[PDB]
Amino acid sequence: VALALRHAILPKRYGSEYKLHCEWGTYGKPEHFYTDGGKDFRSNHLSQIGAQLGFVCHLRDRPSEGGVVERPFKTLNDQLFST
DNA sequence: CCGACGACAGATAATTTGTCACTGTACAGTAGAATATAGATGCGCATCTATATAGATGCAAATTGAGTGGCCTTATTAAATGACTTCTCAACCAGTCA
Numbered sequence A: 001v002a003l004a005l006r007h008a009i010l011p012k013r014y015g016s017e018y019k020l021h022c023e024w025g026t027y028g029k030p031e032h033f034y035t036d037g038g039k040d041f042r043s044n045h046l047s048q049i050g051a052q053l054g055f056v057c058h059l060r061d062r063p064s065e066g067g068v069v070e071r072p073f074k075t076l077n078d079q080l081f082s083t
Numbered sequence B: 001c002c003g004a005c006g007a008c009a010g011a012t013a014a015t016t017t018g019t020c021a022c023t024g025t026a027c028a029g030t031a032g033a034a035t036a037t038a039g040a041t042g043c044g045c046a047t048c049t050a051t052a053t054a055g056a057t058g059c060a061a062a063t064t065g066a067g068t069g070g071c072c073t074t075a076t077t078a079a080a081t082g083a084c085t086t087c088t089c090a091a092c093c094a095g096t097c098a
Helices: A002-009 A044-053 A067-081
Strands: A032-035 A056-059
Touching: A002 A044, A044 A056
Parallel strands: A032 A056
Antiparallel strands: none
16 A cells, blocks of 8 residues: 555656556645555554645445445456456 | 230338447455375385305324334453452571671
8 A cells, every 4th residue: 555655646657668658647645545444544554654644544434435446447357357 | 905024213121330328237355275196206224145254173194203123253372451359568596706
């Protein structure tokens, strides 16, 4: 989770061996971070990251509330990985 | 004259393609993993074997010292040297003489 956070927050660079034709020009710091109840997220380490970055950790009430995280995963099975 | 079939042209739904709106369903930590077997290979330990004896013994020459057995001219004389044996070893009285 700490590694996913820094890759999300920082400006992104990829070399030509990725053959990208548009830029992932996406960066900057969240105000809030919303998650399932896994021990990665409900942890002192993410609490300390959140307090130092100033973002608030929030808990997902059901799997069916977080479809914005979950649904990237079916699309990738259907558009990428099954092929 | 009446009926049937082919040429050419004309109109038409089936077929295929495209577009558009509504929808069932997967995203939700998760099958590489557990549990037998045979079959080959390697290290360890025991259980023999075959060689290698030097010490002891028996025996058979090879002298070696120590025995034993068999074969031989003689009688007189003389001298020389070395020995043995035997015998003997009185003392004063009586008759002359310068």
